Amino acid sequence: CXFXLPGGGGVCXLXSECIX
DSSP: OOSSSOOSSOBTTBSTTTOX
């Protein structure tokens, strides 16, 4: 997250907002 905007603990499509 954010979904599309790599914030803190995720990349665009990579993390809990997508898979994880």
